[PDB]
Amino acid sequence: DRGVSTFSPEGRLFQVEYSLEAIKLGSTAIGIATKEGVVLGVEKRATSPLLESDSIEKIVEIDRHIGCAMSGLTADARSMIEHARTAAVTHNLYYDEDINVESLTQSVCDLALRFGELMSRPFGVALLIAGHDADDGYQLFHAEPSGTFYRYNAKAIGSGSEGAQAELLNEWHSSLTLKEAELLVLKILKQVMEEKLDENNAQLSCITKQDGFKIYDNEKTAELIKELKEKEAAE
Amino acid sequence: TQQPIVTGTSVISMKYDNGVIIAADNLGSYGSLLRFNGVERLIPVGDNTVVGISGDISDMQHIERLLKDLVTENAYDNPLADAEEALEPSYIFEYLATVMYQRRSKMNPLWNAIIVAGVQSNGDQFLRYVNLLGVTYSSPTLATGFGAHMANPLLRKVVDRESDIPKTTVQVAEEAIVNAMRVLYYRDARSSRNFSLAIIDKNTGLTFKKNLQVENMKWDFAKDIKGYGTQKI
Amino acid sequence: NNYDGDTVTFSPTGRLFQVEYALEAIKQGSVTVGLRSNTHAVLVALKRNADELSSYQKKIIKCDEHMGLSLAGLAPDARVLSNYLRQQCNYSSLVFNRKLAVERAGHLLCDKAQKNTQSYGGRPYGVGLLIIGYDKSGAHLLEFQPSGNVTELYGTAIGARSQGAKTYLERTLDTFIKIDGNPDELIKAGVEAISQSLRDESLTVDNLSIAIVGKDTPFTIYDGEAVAKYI
Amino acid sequence: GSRRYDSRTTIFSPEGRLYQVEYALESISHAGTAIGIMASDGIVLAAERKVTSTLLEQDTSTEKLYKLNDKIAVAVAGLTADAEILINTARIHAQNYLKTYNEDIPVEILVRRLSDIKQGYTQHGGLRPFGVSFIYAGYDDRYGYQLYTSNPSGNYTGWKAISVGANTSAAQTLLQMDYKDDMKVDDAIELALKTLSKTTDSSALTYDRLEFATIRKGANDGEVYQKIFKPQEIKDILVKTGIT
Amino acid sequence: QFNPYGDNGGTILGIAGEDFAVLAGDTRNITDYSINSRYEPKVFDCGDNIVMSANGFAADGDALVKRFKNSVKWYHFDHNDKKLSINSAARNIQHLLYSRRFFPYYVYNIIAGLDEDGKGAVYSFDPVGSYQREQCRAGGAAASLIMPFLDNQVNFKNQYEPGTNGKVKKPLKYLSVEEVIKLVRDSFTSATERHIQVGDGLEILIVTKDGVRKEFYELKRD
Amino acid sequence: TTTLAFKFRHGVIVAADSRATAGAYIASQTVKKVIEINPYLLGTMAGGAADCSFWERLLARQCRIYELRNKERISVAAASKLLANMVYQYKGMGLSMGTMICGWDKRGPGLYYVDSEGNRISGATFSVGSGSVYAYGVLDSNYKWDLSVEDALYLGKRSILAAAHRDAYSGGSVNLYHVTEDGWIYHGNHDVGELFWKVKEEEGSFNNVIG
Amino acid sequence: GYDRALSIFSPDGHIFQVEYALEAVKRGTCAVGVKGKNCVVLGCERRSTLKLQDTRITPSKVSKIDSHVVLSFSGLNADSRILIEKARVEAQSHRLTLEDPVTVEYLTRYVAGVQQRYTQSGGVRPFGVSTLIAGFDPRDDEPKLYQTEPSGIYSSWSAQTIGRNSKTVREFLEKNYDRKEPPATVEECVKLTVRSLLEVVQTGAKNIEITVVKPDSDIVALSSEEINQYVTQIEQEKQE
Amino acid sequence: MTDRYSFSLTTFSPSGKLGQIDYALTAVKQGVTSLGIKATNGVVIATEKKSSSPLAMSETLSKVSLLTPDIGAVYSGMGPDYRVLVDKSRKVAHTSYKRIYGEYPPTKLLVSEVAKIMQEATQSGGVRPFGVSLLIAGHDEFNGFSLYQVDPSGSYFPWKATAIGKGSVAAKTFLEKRWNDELELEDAIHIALLTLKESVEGEFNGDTIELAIIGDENPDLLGYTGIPTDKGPRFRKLTSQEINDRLEAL
Numbered sequence A: 001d002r003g004v005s006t007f008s009p010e011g012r013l014f015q016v017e018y019s020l021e022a023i024k025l026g027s028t029a030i031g032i033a034t035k036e037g038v039v040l041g042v043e044k045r046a047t048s049p050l051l052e053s054d055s056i057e058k059i060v061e062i063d064r065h066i067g068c069a070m071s072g073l074t075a076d077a078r079s080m081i082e083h084a085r086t087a088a089v090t091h092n093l094y095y096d097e098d099i100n101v102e103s104l105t106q107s108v109c110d111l112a113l114r115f116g117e118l119m120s121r122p123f124g125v126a127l128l129i130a131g132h133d134a135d136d137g138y139q140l141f142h143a144e145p146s147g148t149f150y151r152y153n154a155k156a157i158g159s160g161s162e163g164a165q166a167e168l169l170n171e172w173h174s175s176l177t178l179k180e181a182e183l184l185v186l187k188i189l190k191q192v193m194e195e196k197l198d199e200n201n202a203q204l205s206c207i208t209k210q211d212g213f214k215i216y217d218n219e220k221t222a223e224l225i226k227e228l229k230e231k232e233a234a235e
Numbered sequence B: 001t002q003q004p005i006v007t008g009t010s011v012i013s014m015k016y017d018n019g020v021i022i023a024a025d026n027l028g029s030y031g032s033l034l035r036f037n038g039v040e041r042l043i044p045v046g047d048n049t050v051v052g053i054s055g056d057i058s059d060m061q062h063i064e065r066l067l068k069d070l071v072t073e074n075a076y077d078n079p080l081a082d083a084e085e086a087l088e089p090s091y092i093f094e095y096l097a098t099v100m101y102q103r104r105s106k107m108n109p110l111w112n113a114i115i116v117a118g119v120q121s122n123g124d125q126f127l128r129y130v131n132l133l134g135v136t137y138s139s140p141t142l143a144t145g146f147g148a149h150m151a152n153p154l155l156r157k158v159v160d161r162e163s164d165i166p167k168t169t170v171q172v173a174e175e176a177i178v179n180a181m182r183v184l185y186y187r188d189a190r191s192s193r194n195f196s197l198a199i200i201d202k203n204t205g206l207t208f209k210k211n212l213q214v215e216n217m218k219w220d221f222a223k224d225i226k227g228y229g230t231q232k233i
Numbered sequence C: 001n002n003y004d005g006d007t008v009t010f011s012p013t014g015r016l017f018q019v020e021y022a023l024e025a026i027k028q029g030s031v032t033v034g035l036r037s038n039t040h041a042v043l044v045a046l047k048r049n050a051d052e053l054s055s056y057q058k059k060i061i062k063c064d065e066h067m068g069l070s071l072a073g074l075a076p077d078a079r080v081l082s083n084y085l086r087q088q089c090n091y092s093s094l095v096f097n098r099k100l101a102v103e104r105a106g107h108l109l110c111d112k113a114q115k116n117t118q119s120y121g122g123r124p125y126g127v128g129l130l131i132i133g134y135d136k137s138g139a140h141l142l143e144f145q146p147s148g149n150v151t152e153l154y155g156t157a158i159g160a161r162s163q164g165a166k167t168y169l170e171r172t173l174d175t176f177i178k179i180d181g182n183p184d185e186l187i188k189a190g191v192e193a194i195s196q197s198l199r200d201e202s203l204t205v206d207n208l209s210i211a212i213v214g215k216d217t218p219f220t221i222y223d224g225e226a227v228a229k230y231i
Numbered sequence D: 001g002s003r004r005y006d007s008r009t010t011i012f013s014p015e016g017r018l019y020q021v022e023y024a025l026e027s028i029s030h031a032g033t034a035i036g037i038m039a040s041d042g043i044v045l046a047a048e049r050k051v052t053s054t055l056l057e058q059d060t061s062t063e064k065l066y067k068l069n070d071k072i073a074v075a076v077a078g079l080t081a082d083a084e085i086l087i088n089t090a091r092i093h094a095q096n097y098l099k100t101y102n103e104d105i106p107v108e109i110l111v112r113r114l115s116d117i118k119q120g121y122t123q124h125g126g127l128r129p130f131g132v133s134f135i136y137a138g139y140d141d142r143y144g145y146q147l148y149t150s151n152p153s154g155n156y157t158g159w160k161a162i163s164v165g166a167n168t169s170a171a172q173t174l175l176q177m178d179y180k181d182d183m184k185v186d187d188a189i190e191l192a193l194k195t196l197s198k199t200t201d202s203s204a205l206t207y208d209r210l211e212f213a214t215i216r217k218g219a220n221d222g223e224v225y226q227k228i229f230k231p232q233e234i235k236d237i238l239v240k241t242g243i244t
Numbered sequence E: 001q002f003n004p005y006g007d008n009g010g011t012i013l014g015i016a017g018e019d020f021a022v023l024a025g026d027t028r029n030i031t032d033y034s035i036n037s038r039y040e041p042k043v044f045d046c047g048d049n050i051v052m053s054a055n056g057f058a059a060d061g062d063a064l065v066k067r068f069k070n071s072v073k074w075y076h077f078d079h080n081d082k083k084l085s086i087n088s089a090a091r092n093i094q095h096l097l098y099s100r101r102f103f104p105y106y107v108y109n110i111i112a113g114l115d116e117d118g119k120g121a122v123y124s125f126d127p128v129g130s131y132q133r134e135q136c137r138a139g140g141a142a143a144s145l146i147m148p149f150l151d152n153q154v155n156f157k158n159q160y161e162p163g164t165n166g167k168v169k170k171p172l173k174y175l176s177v178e179e180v181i182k183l184v185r186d187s188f189t190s191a192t193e194r195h196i197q198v199g200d201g202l203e204i205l206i207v208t209k210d211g212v213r214k215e216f217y218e219l220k221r222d
Numbered sequence F: 001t002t003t004l005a006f007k008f009r010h011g012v013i014v015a016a017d018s019r020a021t022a023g024a025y026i027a028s029q030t031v032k033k034v035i036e037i038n039p040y041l042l043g044t045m046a047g048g049a050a051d052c053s054f055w056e057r058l059l060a061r062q063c064r065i066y067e068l069r070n071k072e073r074i075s076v077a078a079a080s081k082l083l084a085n086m087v088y089q090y091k092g093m094g095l096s097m098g099t100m101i102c103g104w105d106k107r108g109p110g111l112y113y114v115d116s117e118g119n120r121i122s123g124a125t126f127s128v129g130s131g132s133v134y135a136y137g138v139l140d141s142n143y144k145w146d147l148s149v150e151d152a153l154y155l156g157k158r159s160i161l162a163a164a165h166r167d168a169y170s171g172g173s174v175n176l177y178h179v180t181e182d183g184w185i186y187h188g189n190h191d192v193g194e195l196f197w198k199v200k201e202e203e204g205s206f207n208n209v210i211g
Numbered sequence G: 001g002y003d004r005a006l007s008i009f010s011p012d013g014h015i016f017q018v019e020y021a022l023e024a025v026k027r028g029t030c031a032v033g034v035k036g037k038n039c040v041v042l043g044c045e046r047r048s049t050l051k052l053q054d055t056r057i058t059p060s061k062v063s064k065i066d067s068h069v070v071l072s073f074s075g076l077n078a079d080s081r082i083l084i085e086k087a088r089v090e091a092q093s094h095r096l097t098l099e100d101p102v103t104v105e106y107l108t109r110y111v112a113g114v115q116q117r118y119t120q121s122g123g124v125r126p127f128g129v130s131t132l133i134a135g136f137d138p139r140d141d142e143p144k145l146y147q148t149e150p151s152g153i154y155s156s157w158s159a160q161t162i163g164r165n166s167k168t169v170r171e172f173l174e175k176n177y178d179r180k181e182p183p184a185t186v187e188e189c190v191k192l193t194v195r196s197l198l199e200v201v202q203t204g205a206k207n208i209e210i211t212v213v214k215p216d217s218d219i220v221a222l223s224s225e226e227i228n229q230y231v232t233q234i235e236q237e238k239q240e
Numbered sequence H: 001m002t003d004r005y006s007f008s009l010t011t012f013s014p015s016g017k018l019g020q021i022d023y024a025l026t027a028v029k030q031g032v033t034s035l036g037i038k039a040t041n042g043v044v045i046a047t048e049k050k051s052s053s054p055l056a057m058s059e060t061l062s063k064v065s066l067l068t069p070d071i072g073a074v075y076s077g078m079g080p081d082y083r084v085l086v087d088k089s090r091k092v093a094h095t096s097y098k099r100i101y102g103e104y105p106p107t108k109l110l111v112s113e114v115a116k117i118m119q120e121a122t123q124s125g126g127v128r129p130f131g132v133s134l135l136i137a138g139h140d141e142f143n144g145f146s147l148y149q150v151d152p153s154g155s156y157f158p159w160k161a162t163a164i165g166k167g168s169v170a171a172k173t174f175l176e177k178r179w180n181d182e183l184e185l186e187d188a189i190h191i192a193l194l195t196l197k198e199s200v201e202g203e204f205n206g207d208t209i210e211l212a213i214i215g216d217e218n219p220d221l222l223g224y225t226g227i228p229t230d231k232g233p234r235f236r237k238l239t240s241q242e243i244n245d246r247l248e249a250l
């Protein structure tokens, strides 16, 4: 057939580029970074009404100061999350401190290109890694299966990504509050989702310095959805 | 873990104003048997370093080969091997010190005590010690084995501290070393009269003296010594 | 065509296509410039962003107090090779109490990349590196290609549109080599060199990345408002 | 490199089938038919040797029926050489169990172990599977008399009566017709031979083209006896049942 | 039988101030009754405003320091030139020591610097990684000679206020760098008198927000 | 060392001295022998300071990854068992640890004794260290289940004092902890020198000593 | 060792070997899981192409992983044994190291992790198996029902079916199962499970297996006659 | 380097055929004819010494080989493959039997071990099957005389008499007419020479024919005396002269 670690004539790794196509088929995940915190939101996308939606876990805690959202082949993310949690806790063991968000992200991205003929293929999932540390403050990173990671003020991944990213282009400014960011994620998720957005098929989360990483209750998100509807109807 | 078989005794050395001096006798003992009389224990590395070794001779010959190979390896893909990127005394020492500590950490030591003597690129004097345990130290005078007990006291009368180094000439330093070698011949039961001496000067370079002998010895007073107390005849 | 499936296969004209395809990844990468005098050596790199919300990908990596490089191509491969250089520089210090010669650092990178071009299963590195350093024989600049070829130069550039900067340096050769004891003027010549490779976009405060090493200057990287002086 | 020449023995087809397992089953369908029938007081194993010769030494020959231990036997259908590899492993497993627990290995446990080995060759290793289907006839004090089958997929099932190898479709229909639950060994012997006699590709069913075996509690008091039939004994039972 | 360990003598002392810290140690290196060097540095500037001294078996002390310096170097590489805090260094050193739990570094070890609130900090380690932050600590050959003196003159132990007769303690007033350096010199001069492995010289490293400064004082050479 | 811990109605009390010894020489007198593993888990240290510190800090990291994977705080029994299995690997190799894992979980207050020999025991009252034998006298004689938090804290404090007085290798200061279902609560560092005289006067005990 | 990468991405971002493993599941016999208010019922199809079978000794479709958790499946039978063995070993390993039996969610996460590992490991193919894992957590009366599949993804279900013609029985469950009021009793839960299989099975004789799991390790398999009584009552109500 | 062929080179085709085994059997068909006949008091194995050149000394090339003192072997197909199988067969007789039980293996069990080696070359990674069919004649105390055929697949069958290689179909027919259960060893040798003459084109004499027997114990070939129970090898290779003597009474 052909090598797994083969370059194309354009100078790209075939398998890495193909895994990016799998990520485009995944459910939408959005992240927005502010000076009051970083917000993470996801589309749950249940395949059937009998599926208990609260078991869909696409937003995940890595440490108290680091959260993570995923999009693509979500099963592939489990070993990445496991490595991230181990890396975060191991650094706390060796250095008696919280680990930098960038350093954690770099550790996860080191796994990415460990494939050949090590694992047999790249990961088919993208991660939005959000967190806070004392040096660089509130941060949001986009970790790809290429081993590359970019920092972002705001970022959307998944099926409605390019439409959402254009919307985030216009809406984001450096003085956004946390409440404003929450509504903004809900707004853009509602825009790109197939089904109608409610508290059961969408999930919010945030990371603040004080309270750390928190996944929002369905009752708390429901109020933010109701607050969104009223403010859109206000003009 | 082993035991040393064929052994070399003291190596002595000191700094002076423009360089360093190092000396060691030519004997390879086999316990109390003075087996081998033509053993060179000072080994030059380039024209700026001399490694003096005491202890097990088979391990000395091994180290001698590591150093010879080090020179060969440094010349590889190195147009400045006889100039800016030549081997320094500090490079040679750290390599040996690394090897010695690694070998003791595997419980299979090189049963030696080593003094690396030389002059650096910038003209600074280099003199450092390392042994089978990986223990390292530096001083204006250095000596191994018996030399540590008998030579150092004599050499420290010339260079007692760092500030005495510029005040000490090569003629005075050599004289002190040669005297110390005589004292060791009087008092060390595993020493020989024949020895080698090396001078590494920042101006005149490396001078390697072989086939030196202890001379001007005092023995005449022995004729007057009779018995162990009461005996008169 | 039929001979580009893996790195272990020569073509009928004696070419290695997988290595050539890896070389292509460098040409897609953002431009970076290297140049030196007798006292100092300078790296200048144009950083690239994903979009306006994104950060600008870092191009320069420190290897030791006296050595570092800039990258162009696959960034993870630069992380692997720079990590190797960091270890080798470090081995030289711990074992021999000796700062690693820049020329020898190039020989080590060449040999590491070569092994990936002759064996089955693996792949060539998809990145080009510009190594600068100051050692016992003065300032140095090296260019690394993942074919294995390493070249010592007065100045050079790699990445997209790098030919413009390379021509400028070829004209300025006699001038910038003489810039001794003046770091700011040597950087100016580097910033002016990388400017010959720009189209549409210009050098902004979070776009530009500069690094320098010299006689009494440790390898330091300048980003943000620290390079506004040179814009 | 070597990838060029790899057949990839352990992959799914677009329809979700294992290529090599299916092709191994195709191979087995050309092998001599083997039949197993379970009765209330014993088990019968009958099998057809493939186009023999007059110069073949039959009394010292064994290609179909093998002994795993004193309580368990197997009938083979497929590559004999492949079967002997597995048979020796099964014999060792039975002895390991006996050494560990000081009790004879239950039939199912032995069957599961062999079937797991077959399964492994379909999921990893890059090797071709074993082109063998077994009929296991055995007894233990939990379930009594038991018949199992395994195939190259590593899947196994229990049976009252079953056939493997050639003409199983025809053979299974004939067994399904005449089999009854209150059946005895002597009746089961007759059913097995009659089924082979009708499904065989040969002109006539003779003693020299058969291997036969029974597992009976027809041993003096509460115990089990394995009987691998001799050529002369197969000749007699063929006359008794009225086939020759 | 080969003994992989040795005793090179030496004594060290760390004292933490309100906005500074000192790490002192004699410069004498010995085996048995012989002097190897009268000036062989034992306290090092390891970077990030941290000073360290590990000794007893010189070869193990040199290796530990060398490894920790290396650990600091790689901490910068891996975490964006972040400054290694004194508490993080201490925890790192524990793991360097316990990695040889079954072939220990035969050393006493002390580090000193400033904590993240700018206050002086001194950490003490046993050969296998048990560490403690303290205000005052001596380690090495003459540790037992010095520590009781520091309990008295730094923490004012067994000292009460006159007139009360044991009812009210002497209040814990902080010490200045000049007052601390006096206690250090007096500690080492007293130890030199009664301990044969202590003498020749005394090197002190003082750590402030401004950086690391050195001071050297001669000791008796007998 | 002297360390103790005991279960009671209102949780579990944990107490320990602070002395560290190297032969007859008192190397330190400010050692924290109680390690905070999580806001609901404590660990005590006795024997090898380095050993106890390393393995209990490594356990705290195991207990944390547990919470991340399982969305659930680890039980006292599971935590104690992870330690026990960790040290069992190095059995006979020279480790010296005597620990108590104290906490509150779903089954209520929990208290396990774990050592390097291999023991792992659940119990309502423990004391480990060279001075444990002196502390047991005070505990056993005054221990109830219906003990007030105030009286329970005093008992654990008074028990360490008894041992610190008699045992040469115990003393310095007393560290107190109280573990509730809302988590552990630090109840201060108490110098034995000052505490001894105070207790002598208020209680009347230690009549043999003059002061 | 055989290191060949069998599960790889295709240009359109698909891992065909994982998708072909789902086709093996589609071929497998139907399996259904329904959780009531205080129980969970697992129903399984038995294809009647195989008669003369010995039902005493033939491997049953529902397997006990521990005393409080069960696992049924659809797809390759031989593959399912490997997952079940691993799950059983892990269940004992968890009891041994943590002194508690596994939660249903934990066991599912382990099995799902094994399935995922076989989608990006060299020299191996994915499991052609989807599982339904059901039971009750220790000292808990809330019913648990999870599903896994070859890719490694897993999720919780109020009611779910897998295997051949699962599309049809899922259709039935979606309109018949009410979340606000689930099957209050065991009878109602079993009846709904049998009804759902009767949409696909063919004959209601020996083709339907039912296994009821109740709290506190109370697991029992219904017999042919007991199930036949449900089949009788369902069709008699249908004649109207 | 490293052997990166860890996968099977023999695989099932859609029709159920194992191609490499079939092709190996085709190579055996092209090979020179060899045969074996079992008598009441012995066994005979025979083949043609097809010399590649008249300058070549055909005595140095042994097609008939001793495996144990009471077991011999002959082949048809690829010679080099046979030579290595004989080396392995000789060794496995010691390692897997004689060093355990202190006696040589019975014919059927040695055959079983050779068969296993050939089966593994049919399934293991990065190898082709052996391109030979073996005929193994032997004797042991409890089974008496026996003759086995072993194919590239690893399958083995016991024979009263048989032939393999070039003219096996015609030779097997010839043997069916002549074989009975009352044959003496000399009668079997006579039949073997008659059968083998049909497949040989050129010279037919003791120098171009290789023939060995499993028969009575040969104490003269033992090499030592003093142990009554050791009576000598039953395997014996007939000389050039001994063959020619029986060709006059042919």
Ligand SMILES: *[C@@](C)(CO)[C@](*)(O)[C@H](CC(C)C)NC(=O)[C@H](Cc1ccccc1)NC(=O)[C@H](CC(C)C)NC(=O)[C@H](CCc1ccccc1)NC(=O)CN1CCOCC1
Residues within 6 Å of the ligand: E101, E104, E126, E127, E128, E130, F001, F002, F019, F020, F021, F022, F023, F027, F028, F031, F033, F045, F046, F047, F048, F049, F050, F052, F096, F129, F130, F169, F170
């Ligand atoms: C009471 C106080 C004593 O029983 C307690 O049990 C405390 C428990 C606290 C500290 C957690 N235990 C000790 O004080 C403990 C006693 C002990 C000593 C040695 C082995 C086991 C138990 N003391 C220590 O652990 C001290 C703590 C130091 C003083 C801070 N550590 C040492 O003595 C070290 C560790 C030695 C070691 C252990 C295992 C392998 C190798 C080495 N040893 C030294 O520092 C060397 N020692 C210095 C004094 O001179 C003699 C050599």
Ligand SMILES: [Mg+2]
Residues within 6 Å of the ligand: F081, F082, F083, F085, F086
């Ligand atoms: Mg454990």
